[PDB]
Every structure is written in C-alpha cells, then in structure tokens.
A paper describes a structure:
In particular, the compartmentalized self-tagging (CST) strategy enabled the discovery of polymerases capable of processive [name] synthesis. This approach was performed on libraries of mutants of a variant of the replicative B-family DNAP, which was isolated from the archaeal hyperthermophilic [name] (Tgo). To better understand how the mutations added on [name] variants impact the structure of the polymerase, the X-ray structures of the apo form of [name], replicative polymerase [name]_6G12, and reverse transcriptase [name]_RT521 were solved by crystallography. Crystals were obtained for the three polymerases and diffracted at 2.4, 3.1, and 2.35 Å, respectively. The helices α19 and α20 are part of these regions. Hence, overall, the crystal structure of the wild-type [name] appears more stable than the two variants studied here. For instance, compared to their initial position in the Tgo DNAP structure, helices α19 and α20 of the thumb β subdomain of [name] shift by almost 5.5 and 6 Å, respectively. Nevertheless, both structures are in the known and expected “open” conformation. The presence of this antechamber, which is reminiscent of a storage pocket, was actually observed in two other structures, namely the apo-structure of [name] and the binary structure of [name]_6G12, all grown in an excess of ddNTP.
Author numbering: 1 to 610, 612 to 664, 676 to 709, 713 to 757
Write the structure that this text describes.
C-alpha cells in the first residue's frame, strides 16, 4: 500500500518518491518523468507563440515553457479548449504564472497551485492506504526539566518513553528501580538509544500527542545542543518541520507521523484537551497528571522518581491506545479523499471536500476553477439567511412525536440537480426553480456535484450491506468508519457551496438549498395540520415536534405513521420524512431552547444554562424543576421547589457539600489562597471552592470549610447560582426571578 508521496530535486529536475509498504517490506519507488503543468485560456490560438517565449527567473536560472499542447476539457459544463503548458520543475509555476496571466491575449490560467506530490496521486489514479497491509506502530512521549523564565528547550530531556504491542518502556539517565525503565549514562545516550529502538523496530507509524508543536521541536533543539544527528526518517533524514498557518506540523520521511492532537480536536468536543482528559473521555478510565514542577523537584532531589517514571510510561501507553482507536478511522478517511493520512488528519472539512472534488474533476476531464483572489475573497464574506425556525407554541404539551427529513440538503442537491454548472444554463429544456430566490437549475444533464453526491450515497449503501454481512469484527469496524465518513463528506457539500475559499463556491446554490429546505419543511407542516389535525409545536431546519392535543399516545403514534405514508408518496426524488422519536411530555421555551421526556422517563434538553461556575445546588434544583414539569406535569410544584430551596438557603439549612463550585472575583480570591499553600496556578478544572459572606463586593477551598468558623453567602447562591439556573425555564411559564426568591 501507498503511505505517502513527495519530491526531491536532482540537478534541477523533480523526482517523485512513492513510499510504500508491500508484503511486510518498505519500498521507495521513483518517477523522473512526471512533468508539472498549468492550463491557459487564450483569446486566439496564434498567441501561443508569444506565450512560449515568456520567461521568468528562479535562482539565477531562466525558467521557460518547455512545451505546449491544445486540449479539450469541460469547464462548468461547457466545452472548452485550453493550452496545457509544461514546465521543467514545479517551482517554475509560482515564478512565471503571473507573467503568463498578465499577457493581454491570456483570458485566464488554471490549476497552477496544485502541489506536485498531490498532483501525482490524482493524475496517476493512486489511492493511499488501500489494501490489507498491517502497519507497525510506535507511540512516544518525553519528560523535560522545566524552569519558569527560560527559553524553549533550555532544560534537558529527562525521560523518553515509547509503547507498542510489546508494552511500554522508559529510557532515562538516572537510576530508577522499575522493571520497564532502561538506564543510560547521559541525555545524549538516551536520545541515541531512542534512535536505535526506532531503527530496530522500524515502525510505519510514529504516534504522538501534540508532537507537531512540542515533542519534535524539543528533540531538535536538544540534538543541536548535544551534536546528535536525529535521523528518524527511513531514508536517513531528520524530521521536517512545516508551517500550517499559526501552528506547525512535522513529517518523518518514510513513516507516518500521526499526531493525535489535531484529530481529537475535530472528532470530539471537550472543555480541555489535555492527554488526561482525552483518555478519560474515550476509554472511561482515569489518568493522573504529574506537573512540570513535581518533575523538576523529583529530578533535583532524586526523591519520587518512580512516580515520574510511571507517569512517563503511562503517557506512551495511552498515546498508543488512543492511536489504535483513531488511526483506522483516519486511514479510511485517506482512502476516501485520496490523499495521505498525514495531510488528511491535519485538514479541515473544506479542504477534504476540495481534494475529493479535485480528484473527481481529473477523472471526468473537468477543468478545475481557481481559488479566490483577496478581492474576490472579501466579496464572499456576505451575510446568510437559511433554515426555517418556527417560534414555538408556549406551554406544556403531551404525547409528542418528532419527525425529520433523511439527509435533507444532500437530497435537495441530487433531486434538483443543484450545481454551479447547471445554474441558469441557457437554452435549457427542463429546469427546477428554487422558491423565493428563483435560481433555475438545468436538468438536461447531471451536474458535477449532484452526480458525485449520488455516487457517494450509492457507495455508502454498498458499504452498509457489506458491514452487516461480514462476521469479521475488525472488517466490520473498518466498514463502519468508511460508511460514517461517507455520510460526513456528503453532508459537507452544502457548507462547501458557501465556503469562501472554495474553488466550486456558489452562493446561488447554497441559498437555493436552504430555500428548498424551508419550502419542504413548511409544506409538510401545513399538510399535517390541515389534513391530520396535528398541532406543530416547534420546528428547526429539517424536523418538527407535533401532537394531537386531545389524543392518546397510541392514537398519536398511529396517525403519525399514516401521515408519513401520505407525505412520502407526495415528496419528490430522494426527499423522505422519517419517524425519529416519541415523547411523553415537552415544553418549548424559545427557538433552539426546549426540554422533552421519553417513555423511559429520560429528560432530553437543548439550550439550557447547563458554564463552569456552577454548584451542585444549582444543578440539583434545575433537575428537580425539570422533573416536576416533565415527569409530574406540575409547574406549580416546580415553583414551590425553587421557593423551598431559596428559603432553605436563606435560613442556612442547606448542607455545604451541595455548595461546592468546580472551576474575576471569587476565582481570583480562591487562587490567592491556593497559591499561599504552595499549590501552583495551573490550567485545570480541579478547583473546588465555596463562597462565604466576605463583606467585600470571599472564596475558600471546600477542604477548609468549617461551619463553626465560616458561613456561606446565602445571597450569592440564590442570586448567582440557583435563580439563574432555573430562571430561563420558569420564565417560559410566566414567572419572574422575584416570583421565586422566600
């Protein structure tokens, strides 16, 4: 299988390198005959002789057009004849493209900024990560000596840990009596020892957590300080550092540097992205953090080195475990988009769609439009208006069904052939007109994007069938990832239409999809109201909550199934309405804010106060109010609960344990008290404090709370904690803040 591609320059000529892993053997293939090229649209074919003589300079050397050939391509559905201009080296293109564009007879130039190694994969039809080759992986982490006020990598590397199927080990230059610790004489010997393990193990994948912006940079500066050739690459190279906007990225030639940090940053949403928080969210198991001060103290005193070595071992162990969990998904994403795992794991949704489109465009002889210039880019940042949101019916409702469209936006794009190449195509015999906006889309031929989107949905179904039929659990997980990634790619096309940097950007397409979506949801609502007697309580973009106010639970379910059969027969093409849940009770506060409860008595919420500055009394009272309303149907009881809680708080009857806040006023006051005890100020959600009557404008750690010495601030927990947490819920029922505080 293909791992990656790149190029080196030898005597001014580019040489493509294909890094492969075939039958348990690493291989490098070379291609010295791939010519870089760009396209040029001319007003007259006679002008080609003027374009051939256009020259520029790279580094003293004169860059010129090697040869040209006239080709026939499609450009936004219309046939076009352009000149394919060949060059000696890919770096000739940035040097001459402006001089060719500025030529009067040149209407425009195309495909002039496509990286050579990526252009090779597309043009040769090569797909990375394809096949059943098993890759060898190795995770690693480092521990450093930190001092506040010193330059980057001023202190030495204390330990280097690594982990794989054989387990986790720690290399260090101090005596540690642990079975998994290997002891060397110096920091230099430790780094050299790590090089030998990577060389002997010869892993295809090097797994790190934030290795792009820390680990590799630290190792690089230390190896320069110690005079070590840090040869991690399979061809004898040192790790290559690249610039990715405001941050960095590291390649290790011949292998795949898989940095888990950007991957997990996109996949899951967490308050903090420390290695400890991430591991605990994915595996549900705890991981203790050992801070830089504790590491430095242990190394200088020589006391407690077992604890630091165990932490270093766990870092490598959990990084290998997380790498085993996220790599197969990224390998499937690489197969899907057609680019290396290295690029795919570090790219955004917009870039992933573009690279998929660029490959498909080449396959279909479709000339790709250019990226927007700075002027055009500013023109594409205009406001938006898409998605219907109904203002909800106020009050408590019973026996509610939730109905929604299956893939509304992709269905619209396919059904109505929405594409920049079908938009207002003159002489069209058949067309669909977008409501309100009035954009017409030709139906005479399949549009580029709807055609690909249709093939994606067909491929997804073929993948789902294979998944359900395969007994092999590893293959089932792989098919599951591919299937899920196809769904995500299909649901990225709408957003891509309105994506300012997109080559195939089309605001008319984007507005048309939302206008059609507004029409389908609004027509379905009036249909269920007029012909089935349902009341639509709330609706947002592709679904709605409905009920028959005086009907029982089985009656509402039956009528909903009958409505689905009715409207699905009327819906065109791929559009389909679905039954996605029944709820015993529910209330809809405002747009995007509501709460509902299923038959299993499970409360589902959206748009509630549930920030980091919150106590167990505020969380408990909100749950109690929600339960009284949704489970008992008693809104007056929910009010009495708040009145009871505020009265108990004012009379000091609430236990202090329910007043602890876990995390500017209280926070800075508690920070001073914690720093006074030797505890360093570190970013973490571990601060547990309680607010006292401080008579200032007051916070102490909960461990030090004593009822005989301290009295909590009842007014603070009423006005800043309990009331704000329940206020939005009870304001929907007509109650003000003052109607609850006794």
């Amino acid at each position: 299988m293909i791992l990656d591609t790149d190029y080196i320059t030898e005597d001014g000529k580019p040489v493509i390198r294909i890094f492969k892993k075939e039958n348990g053997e690493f291989k490098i293939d070379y291609d010295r005959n791939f010519e870089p090229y760009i396209y040029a649209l001319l007003k007259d074919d006679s002008a080609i002789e003027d374009v051939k003589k256009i020259t520029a300079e790279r580094h003293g050397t004169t860059v010129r057009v090697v040869r040209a050939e006239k080709v026939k391509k499609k450009f936004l559905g219309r046939p076009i004849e352009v000149w394919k201009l060949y060059f000696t080296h890919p770096q000739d293109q940035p040097a001459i493209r402006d001089k060719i564009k500025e030529h009067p007879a040149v209407v425009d130039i195309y495909e002039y900024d496509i990286p050579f190694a990526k252009r090779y994969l597309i043009d040769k039809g090569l797909i990375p990560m394809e096949g059943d080759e098993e890759l060898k992986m190795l995770a690693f982490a480092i521990a450093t000596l930190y001092h506040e006020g010193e330059e980057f990598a001023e202190g030495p590397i204390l330990m280097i840990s690594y982990a794989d199927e054989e387990g986790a080990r720690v290399i260090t230059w101090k005596n540690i009596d642990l079975p998994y610790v290997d002891v060397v004489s110096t920091e230099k010997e430790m780094i050299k020892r790590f090089l030998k393990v990577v060389k002997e193990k010869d892993p295809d994948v090097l797994i790190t957590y934030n290795g792009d912006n820390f680990d590799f940079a630290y190792l690089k500066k230390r190896s320069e300080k110690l005079g070590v050739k840090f040869i991690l690459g399979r061809e004898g190279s040192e790790p290559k550092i690249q610039r990715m906007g405001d941050r960095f990225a590291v390649e290790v030639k011949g292998r795949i540097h898989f940095d888990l940090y950007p991957v997990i940053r996109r996949t899951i949403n967490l308050p903090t992205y420390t290695l400890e928080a991430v591991y605990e969210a994915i595996f549900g198991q705890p991981k203790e953090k050992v801070y830089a001060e504790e590491i430095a103290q242990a190394w200088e005193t020589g006391e407690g080195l077992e604890r630091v070595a165990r932490y270093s071992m766990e870092d490598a162990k959990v990084t290998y475990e997380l790498g085993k969990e996220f790599f197969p998904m990224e390998a499937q994403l690489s197969r899907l988009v057609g680019q290396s795992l290295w690029d795919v794991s570090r790219s955004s949704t917009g870039n992933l769609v573009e690279w998929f489109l660029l490959r498909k465009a080449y396959e279909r002889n479709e000339l790709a439009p250019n990226k927007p210039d700075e002027r055009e880019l500013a023109r594409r940042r205009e406001s938006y208006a898409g998605g219907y949101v109904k203002e909800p019916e106020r009050g408590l409702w019973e026996n509610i069904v939730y109905l929604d469209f299956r893939s509304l936006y992709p269905s619209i794009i396919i059904t109505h052939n929405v594409s920049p190449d079908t938009l207002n195509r003159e002489g069209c015999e058949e067309y669909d007109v977008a409501p309100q906006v009035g954009h017409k889309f030709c139906k005479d031929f399949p549009g580029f994007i709807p055609s690909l989107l249709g093939d994606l949905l067909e491929e997804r179904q073929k993948v789902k069938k294979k998944m359900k039929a395969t007994i092999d659990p590893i293959e089932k997980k792989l098919l599951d990832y591919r299937q899920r990634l196809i769904k995500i790619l299909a649901n990225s096309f709408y957003g891509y239409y309105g994506y300012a940097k997109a080559r195939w950007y089309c605001k008319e397409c984007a507005e048309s999809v939302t206008a059609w979506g507004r029409q389908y949801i609004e027509t379905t609502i009036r249909e269920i109201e007029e012909k089935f007697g349902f009341k639509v309580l709330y609706a947002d973009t592709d679904g709605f909550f409905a009920t028959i106010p005086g009907a029982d639970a089985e009656t509402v379910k039956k009528k909903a199934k009958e409505f689905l059969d009715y409207i699905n027969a009327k819906l065109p093409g791929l559009l389909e309405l679905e039954y996605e849940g029944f709820y015993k009770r529910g209330f809809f506060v405002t747009k995007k804010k509501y709460a509902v409860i299923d038959e299993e008595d499970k409360i589902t919420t959206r748009g509630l106060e549930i920030r980091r500055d919150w106590s167990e009394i505020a969380k408990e009272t909100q749950a109690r109010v929600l339960e009284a309303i949704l489970k008992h149907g008693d809104v007056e009881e929910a009010v009495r609960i708040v009145k009871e809680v505020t009265e108990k708080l004012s009379k000091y009857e609430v236990p202090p344990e329910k007043l602890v806040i876990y995390e500017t006023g209280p926070h800075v006051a508690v920070a001073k008290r914690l720093a006074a005890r030797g505890i360093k100020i570190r970013p973490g959600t571990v601060i547990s404090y309680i607010v006292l009557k401080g008579s200032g404008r007051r916070a102490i750690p909960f461990d030090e709370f004593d009822p005989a010495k301290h009295k909590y601030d009842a007014e603070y927990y009423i006005e800043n904690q309990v009331l704000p947490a329940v206020e939005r819920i009870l304001r929907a029922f007509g109650y003000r803040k003052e109607d609850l505080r006794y």
